[PDB]
Nucleic acid binder design. Structure first.
Ligand SMILES: [Mg+2]
Ligand SMILES: [Mg+2]
Ligand SMILES: [Mg+2]
Ligand SMILES: [Mg+2]
Ligand SMILES: [Mg+2]
Ligand SMILES: [Mg+2]
Ligand SMILES: [Mg+2]
Ligand SMILES: [Mg+2]
Ligand SMILES: [Mg+2]
Ligand SMILES: [Mg+2]
Ligand SMILES: [Mg+2]
Ligand SMILES: [Mg+2]
Ligand SMILES: [Mg+2]
Ligand SMILES: [Mg+2]
Ligand SMILES: [Mg+2]
Ligand SMILES: [Mg+2]
Ligand SMILES: [Mg+2]
Ligand SMILES: [Mg+2]
Ligand SMILES: [Mg+2]
Ligand SMILES: [Mg+2]
Ligand SMILES: [Mg+2]
Ligand SMILES: [Mg+2]
Ligand SMILES: [Mg+2]
Ligand SMILES: [Mg+2]
Ligand SMILES: [Mg+2]
Ligand SMILES: [Mg+2]
Ligand SMILES: [Mg+2]
Ligand SMILES: [Mg+2]
Ligand SMILES: [Mg+2]
Ligand SMILES: [Mg+2]
Ligand SMILES: [Mg+2]
Ligand SMILES: [Mg+2]
Ligand SMILES: [Mg+2]
Ligand SMILES: [Mg+2]
Ligand SMILES: [Mg+2]
Ligand SMILES: [Mg+2]
Ligand SMILES: [Mg+2]
Ligand SMILES: [Mg+2]
Ligand SMILES: [Mg+2]
Ligand SMILES: [Mg+2]
Ligand SMILES: [Mg+2]
Ligand SMILES: [Mg+2]
Ligand SMILES: [Mg+2]
Ligand SMILES: [Mg+2]
Ligand SMILES: [Mg+2]
Ligand SMILES: [Mg+2]
Ligand SMILES: [Mg+2]
Ligand SMILES: [Mg+2]
Lengths: 184, 258
RNA sequence: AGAUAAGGGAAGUCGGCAAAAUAGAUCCGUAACUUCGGGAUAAGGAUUGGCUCUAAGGGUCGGGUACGAUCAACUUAGAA
RNA sequence: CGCCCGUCGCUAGUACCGAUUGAAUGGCUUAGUGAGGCCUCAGGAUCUGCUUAGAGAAGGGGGCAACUCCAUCUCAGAGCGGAGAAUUUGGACAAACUUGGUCAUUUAGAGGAACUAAAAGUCGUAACAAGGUUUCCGUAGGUGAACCUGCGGAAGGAUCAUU
RNA sequence: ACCCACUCGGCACCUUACGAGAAAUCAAAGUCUUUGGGUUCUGGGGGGAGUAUGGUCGCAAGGCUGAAACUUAAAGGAAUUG
RNA sequence: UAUCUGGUUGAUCCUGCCAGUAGUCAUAUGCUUGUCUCAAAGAUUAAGCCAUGCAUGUCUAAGUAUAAGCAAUUUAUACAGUGAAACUGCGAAUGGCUCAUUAAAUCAGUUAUCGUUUAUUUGAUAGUUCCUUUACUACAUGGUAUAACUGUGGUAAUUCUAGAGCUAAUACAUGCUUAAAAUCUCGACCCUUUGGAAGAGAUGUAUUUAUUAGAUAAAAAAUCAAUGUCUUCGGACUCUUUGAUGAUUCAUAAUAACUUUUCGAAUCGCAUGGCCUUGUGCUGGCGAUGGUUCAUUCAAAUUUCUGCCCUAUCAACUUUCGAUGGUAGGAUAGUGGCCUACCAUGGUUUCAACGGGUAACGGGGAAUAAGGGUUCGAUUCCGGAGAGGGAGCCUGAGAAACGGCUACCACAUCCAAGGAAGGCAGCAGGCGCGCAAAUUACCCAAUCCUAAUUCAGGGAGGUAGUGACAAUAAAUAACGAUACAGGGCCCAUUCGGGUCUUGUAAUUGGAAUGAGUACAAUGUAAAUACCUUAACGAGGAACAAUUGGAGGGCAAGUCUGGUGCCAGCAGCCGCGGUAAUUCCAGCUCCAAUAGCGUAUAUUAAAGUUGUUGCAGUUAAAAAGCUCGUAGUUGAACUUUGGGCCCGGUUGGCCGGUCGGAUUUCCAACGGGGCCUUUCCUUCUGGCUAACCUUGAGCUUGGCGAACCAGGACUUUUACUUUGAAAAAAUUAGAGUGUUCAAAGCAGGCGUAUUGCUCGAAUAUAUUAGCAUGGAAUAAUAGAAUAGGACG
């Protein structure tokens, strides 16, 4: 008799299971961005479908409409804030013209790879998972983070981590113990 | 069923209390008092959720039982006493004075007032009648009975109450050009200067009401509370003074002051 | 020749032969089948006295150019 | 040397009709009997207040001698009442039971008569070519079986055709 | 009574396909994804089956209404070459 | 994210279904399972049955305490501190669980009570009550029990109780104490007619009946019946009181009484103060409890309109003895055939009555959806109904109550067989039933509720346990160096080095890390977890990812071995009969991945239910033909055009500001007013408004809506616009670092020493009902034997 917790599904499987075009296209995407399932691509396409549906049912209404103006400006602002949509493209049809690689280009994994602290998206993935990162001054261990176009100036290594100092590390301390034993 | 209900679940409470849907199965049911439980505010939710002066019903009870808080001059050490529209709440500690008025979103605001303003309240008369032995009396919106009124005081008028005694200082009539407070419905919280009212003998007399920005609307006569004539009000209005900014200009102001 | 019998109830007998049970009237209800006419009083139930009342059901006379008076019936229904 | 129909015979399965006034379960209900409490007509166990009330004895105050007045233990007896359990009349509500009736759902059944398969079973060869009697419809009759025949109709005919 | 020209209403016919249709073919079977003139009736894979049952009509023969169990991946339409 | 594919054939195009495909807050089940957050959970079959243990009790300063209870007051000799028990007062009618019944019933939205009850709050509200009311009387306050308690007992047993003895109340049951004045009645007596009186009684509120008032758009006159206040008796005559609603016999008041007679404080705690004629004299505060009536609040009960799935192999139903209505009465808290008496013959139905079925509680909502839609909704919120089946009832404001009684029926418990006690569709839990659903745990710390009430209680609720019901995030490895094999470029010196490369290794390295332990701290009612964090904790044989498949549909083998129309596979087509791309295995590969498959149901696919949007010559389907009622649909036609103005939006250089904004502007776009034969309702009043109103360049005087109130009438709808209303949650959606996210409604900013501040929007929410603008479209009516309009 308490208020039920709301929950939602964040993805959607495609209609046709086996078609080679979608299969190898999304496998190219997963290989280029360092993902572990098709579920991430499904989630991103689900978010894009919702965004495109909002843009469609806003465009059915004419301009000068308060709802269209309000929510179109809100959506455009949220996209240019996350950096998936460039500043010149703010006309609500490029929002329809977006694709999933624009969203995947803003994940923390590929952002670390572009900043060059990884040398590979898989290195970025294991770094983020192993807590050697701080998007502001706070550790984040989620690769699908969607940085907000102002945090790239603050993406760096965590202060309480190796590659940020203040302790060498576990197997480094082990090797120091073994070489102190050999010193004895 | 079988008698009166004594509980009130969350998700059944009125939404303008701003009770979170989590943190408990139940809501504080207002006890019987001068106002309907829908258009009321318990002292527990007023002290805890609006003023943050307490964190628990236990702390609200600890405040109440030592007779700190008083409403309309009476102490009222009840956790679920229904405080309604224009009820004044005096905290002698902190020498604070609040008047329960709606903000324009339709919820009760923390409108701090001074002491000379806290020394009275307005009441909308609901019926004028003849009591026993021919004594005339009025009934205000908070169930107050006041005997021997002025004979010109008819229904849907506003009387100013002394709040130490139950006497009437003066009264505002009801016609065009009067500053009103909308208490009920979709336009709950606006202030809009009656232009004219249409009768419709048989139910729900309507009144047309236009704010300072010339944005007109219409309301049933049940939800209107005249608070003076145009310009000067008889009370201190809260922030905004009932304009009902659209969402566009609201976010423009939020981007202005930030 | 006429009757009555505890408990059982056709074990009697070729066979319920004989006897018993049922029965009138009012109300309720009435199946299969049918040549649609019947079956039918189908089957199967309830009531029924006395006394005191109540209600309804009629005739003949009466009206310038709605009713009143009077007389007499056994029929049904209901209530204490 | 294709395809293909039906009877009959074997095996298996599904449902139908079916004597048995079949059976079981559930619902509803006539009639009868009818608990319980409620409302009423009484009823009065018992308890209790008041007005008294008379006899027999104690004490006290007074003609002080019998005698007179007021109180105390005793027990009849009378009313004025008040509360009031059991029990009880009648009424309405009415559970429940019995016996019938009716409806619904399953469920047995000798036998009968279908359908579906299976299976290279038996008899024929009805249809597809003019399928060897052109096919088919309706209706009636008949015959082991497909089927045949009669009357009328149709072209889905084997004829769009004789100025 | 014929002939010519025209007209209304018929039974039809010939040629083409703008069009339609799966095609055969169709001046309606067209004006139907560029999907709406008005309206009635009927069908939803094939069998079981127009069967069983229950009504109702009929002298009867039968008519009207009318299932289910079960079973099956095809039956079927129009054309093509053999 | 408006998508199709395989299967009838020798081949083709179709109709048409079968099978595939995706999803499911739809369940079950198989295999597997590392982490974080969140979280459903004996509904489906049996509203079947229940062992055991809990789930409703409760006090202050303020009802009652001689506990033969604990203390110590030391202020107390009546008590006065705490306080079990019991009486008393409230509560136990809320919550919680379940969905059996139930198909105009419930329920939703929308009305109404001018047709009613309402504890509790909250605000007001009793000077009237001594009854022969001059002793009848305590009013510094009156009576009787009785529990607890003491003691004697009963039975096998129960929350069983008897007898005896005390004692209290805010328990019961009685009962007084406060003005004055006014008005009515009777009325002694004086006695006059003009007739006046002493005195007595009644006059609160509540109930019951009867009656009266509770009014009125306007102006004057004529005389009488008697003069009426005062007269200069000419008559000056006024003053005269009347609230509300759309509407009342309303509110309220007043007379006559009626009542077996209600209420009108015999109650309690703190503070103890002022006046003196200094007496326990008279006054005197802050509260608590109670109390009659009204209003209010929490409600409740009825109630208006419209709306519910499938069935005609249910077409007529209701009415004996209630069906529809009338009158009157009973009953109810009230309306009402709710019931009774009398009377009438009514009421519903092809616009689907009635009956039957529902594996039917309704709704908010859920799944799937290009749109339309289809299916589900036992279940977190609202509203109903129920406590094993029926029925009845006490108490109480509120129950037809069941963690309350009584009876019957069905099950069922204990007995020293006499008798007694029963209702888990509350929380755990246990049998059954099943394809199918968890601990007989901890706690009132939060959310709230109850009580006499800050304190007590609460299986309501929260916390943890079980939990692959569903959702969110997300490990199972990363980077080097060596050995091969590329692609440009320096050399263009034979094929020599190869810089920089992208992959493979019975090559090898140091780093990184969490799962997992765990000191601690945090966390929490106390813990377990989470977030932190010492120390420990990867090198493969480890810390090892599964499920299903590889002919097609439909991703991925003509690889190897075995079987040989066998075993078996195969959703469908089909594979298998000694060279199996389909079986059983190995290898390899593929799809999804801590999840995958299977069954069943449902949605899309399905334009295979077709309103959007099917088909009917031959594939299934035009009734044999015509008439014909209901139903559906139904020709055209009635103010158009032309002008003149006013002012809004979008523009437009001016940008006259530094990619923001203005005005005189060419135009478009929508509005309003007036005129062209064009009333497009007007009467009483007031504002007289815009006013011929003009005082000299801001003054003295026009026509009522542009502001109202009442009015007389007023053709009716449908449709459509706008608005009120349509609970929250859910849905969409604005904002916001839950570390991302599902979520949640939070938060953010400072000199952080004292603080400041934004929020918690908005939209949708059908139909019905309400108000409003339009008046085309579709209906409807009017003046035709003029008993028509103007007047
Ligand atoms: Mg409350
Ligand atoms: Mg005998
Ligand atoms: Mg015999
Ligand atoms: Mg014999
Ligand atoms: Mg014999
Ligand atoms: Mg014999
Ligand atoms: Mg005989
Ligand atoms: Mg017979
Ligand atoms: Mg042969
Ligand atoms: Mg043969
Ligand atoms: Mg032949
Ligand atoms: Mg032949
Ligand atoms: Mg032949
Ligand atoms: Mg032939
Ligand atoms: Mg022959
Ligand atoms: Mg044919
Ligand atoms: Mg011709
Ligand atoms: Mg002809
Ligand atoms: Mg079909
Ligand atoms: Mg069929
Ligand atoms: Mg053919
Ligand atoms: Mg074929
Ligand atoms: Mg073939
Ligand atoms: Mg399918
Ligand atoms: Mg059920
Ligand atoms: Mg409840
Ligand atoms: Mg009160
Ligand atoms: Mg009546
Ligand atoms: Mg009547
Ligand atoms: Mg049910
Ligand atoms: Mg509920
Ligand atoms: Mg109940
Ligand atoms: Mg049970
Ligand atoms: Mg009960
Ligand atoms: Mg119980
Ligand atoms: Mg249980
Ligand atoms: Mg495998
Ligand atoms: Mg396999
Ligand atoms: Mg393939
Ligand atoms: Mg295969
Ligand atoms: Mg294999
Ligand atoms: Mg579709
Ligand atoms: Mg079709
Ligand atoms: Mg055909
Ligand atoms: Mg025909
Ligand atoms: Mg017709
Ligand atoms: Mg018509
Ligand atoms: Mg309408």
């Amino acid at each position: 008799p308490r208020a039920p917790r709301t929950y939602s599904k964040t993805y959607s499987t495609p209609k046709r299971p086996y078609e080679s075009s979608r299969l190898d296209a999304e496998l190219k995407l997963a290989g280029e961005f360092g993902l572990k399932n098709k579920k991430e691509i499904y989630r991103i396409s689900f978010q894009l479908s919702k965004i495109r549906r909002a843009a469609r049912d806003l465009l059915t209404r004419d301009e000068k409409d308060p709802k269209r103006l309000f929510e179109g400006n809100a959506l455009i602002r949220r996209l240019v804030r996350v950096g998936v949509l460039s500043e010149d493209k703010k006309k609500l049809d490029y929002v329809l013209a977006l694709k999933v690689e624009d969203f995947l280009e803003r994940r923390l994994q590929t952002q670390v790879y572009k900043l060059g602290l990884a040398k590979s998206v898989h290195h970025a993935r294991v770094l983020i998972t192993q807590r050697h990162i701080a998007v502001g001054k706070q550790i984040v261990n989620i690769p699908s983070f969607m940085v907000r176009l102002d945090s790239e100036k603050h993406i760096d290594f965590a202060p309480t981590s190796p590659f940020g100092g203040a302790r060498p590390g576990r197997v480094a301390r082990r090797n120091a113990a073994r070489k102190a034993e050999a010193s004895g | 069923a079988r008698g009166p209900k004594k509980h009130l679940k969350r998700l059944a409470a009125p939404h303008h209390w701003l009770l979170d849907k989590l943190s408990g199965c139940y809501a504080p049911r207002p006890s019987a008092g001068p106002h309907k439980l829908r258009e009321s505010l318990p002292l527990i939710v007023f002290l805890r959720n609006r003023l943050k002066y307490a964190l628990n019903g236990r702390e609200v009870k600890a405040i109440l039982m030592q007779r700190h808080v008083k409403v309309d001059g009476k102490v009222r050490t009840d956790t679920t006493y229904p405080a309604g529209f224009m009820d004044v709440i005096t905290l002698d500690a902190t020498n604070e004075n609040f008047r329960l008025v709606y903000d324009v979103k339709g919820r009760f605001a923390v409108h701090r007032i001074t002491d000379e303003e806290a020394s009275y309240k307005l009441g909308k008369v609901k019926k004028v009648q003849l009591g026993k032995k021919g004594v005339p009396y009025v009934v205000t919106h908070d169930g107050r009975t006041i005997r021997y009124p002025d004979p010109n005081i008819k229904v849907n008028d506003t009387v100013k109450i002394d709040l130490a005694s139950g006497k009437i200082t003066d009264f505002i009539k009801f016609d065009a050009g009067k500053l009103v407070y909308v208490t009920g419905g979709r336009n709950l919280g606006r202030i809009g200067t009656i232009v004219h009212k249409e009768r419709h003998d048989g139910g729900f007399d309507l009144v047309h009401i236009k704010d300072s920005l010339d944005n007109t609307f219409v309301t049933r006569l049940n939800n209107v509370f005249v608070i003076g004539e145009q310009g000067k009000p008889y009370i201190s209005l809260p922030k905004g003074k009932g304009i009902k900014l659209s969402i566009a200009e609201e976010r423009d102001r939020r981007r202005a002051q930030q």
